[PDB]
Design a binder for this molecule. Sequence first.
Ligand SMILES: [Cl-]
Ligand code: NA
Ligand code: NA
Ligand code: NA
Lengths: 186, 206
Amino acid sequence: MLRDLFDRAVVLSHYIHNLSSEMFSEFDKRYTHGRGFITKAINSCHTSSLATPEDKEQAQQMNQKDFLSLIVSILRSWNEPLYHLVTEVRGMQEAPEAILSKAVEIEEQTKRLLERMELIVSQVHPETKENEIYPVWSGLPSLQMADEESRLSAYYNLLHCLRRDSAKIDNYLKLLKCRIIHNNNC
Amino acid sequence: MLPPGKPEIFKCRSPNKETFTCWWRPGTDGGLPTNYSLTYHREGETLMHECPDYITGGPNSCHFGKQYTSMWRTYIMMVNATNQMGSSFSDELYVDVTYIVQPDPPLELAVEVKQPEDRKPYLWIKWSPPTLIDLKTGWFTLLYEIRLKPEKAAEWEIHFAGQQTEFKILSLHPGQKYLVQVRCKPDHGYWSAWSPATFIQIPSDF
Ligand SMILES: [Cl-]
Ligand code: NA
Ligand code: NA
Ligand code: NA
């Protein structure tokens, strides 16, 4: 039942992106508002090496098989950093309660979304090759540094990249729903 | 005899995630600018570019058409104000198109009174998206809200319509005239201005 799957997938991706945007903004307000932390967020996402469409025409040029596979790769690449975000924040003596609660929810829902996407792939493309190639995040030491300015900047980059990649995943899934179920007549 | 004051790029907006425009203003307490130059670079490029279109957006504006606009990539931009005597640069502004989206209001708002036979009468409201949004491919997703009130009522009644372009409202007051407006927002972004009102006399025989 594609229609039900795509609807639930889109509910989760919209919800995840919205939570990620709110988490970023609480974190920015509370820890980095007065700074060139934004000026340092530039070109530092672990997924940036993936060929991801950046406008409507690139999205339209990308065929659906590769597109679904791209979304799955991004989501699979986020398992690792979301696990470490939650683990590290949860492990604070004084954990910012609103921030932690959102991180936990995105960690858990991102897993559920990836399950929905793998169901979608098995329906729409029953023989896509079973080979992972997703980019590796390896930013844990900078999240663990004692130097507070470096630590904070590493967290800022992580949440800025999360907010960006959840937005892409959500938008690409909305495009694919329209395309696959409605022949681009949403 | 004075060089221009320090200018400020104070607003950017994208109406549809396909183009965007930015606007700047003078930094009073300087002379009169005879030229402005807006330049920018992108995250992960070194090339410096100039504003591609100083006309479309009106006064003191830079418009970025489709071939210059992309999402999920920061624009780092700056404007300088120059005259014969010297020059001044704005602060750099960091702009991501994803986060500056505010649509134009919806169009063609129309309202009709519908009386079926034994079964609640209702107000039928219909509208269209703003032009130049791409809803059909799912590039863009729009959500809508209606509001309505008679003259002199202290509070508007607001109805969230989600993604529908029509809506039905049951409990109006017989004999009352209502002002009705509609606004829209992207799935993730800012509400548009409300549309101009359409007016509707709800008949006595309601
Ligand atoms: Cl708003
Ligand atoms: Na524009
Ligand atoms: Na201009
Ligand atoms: Na473009």
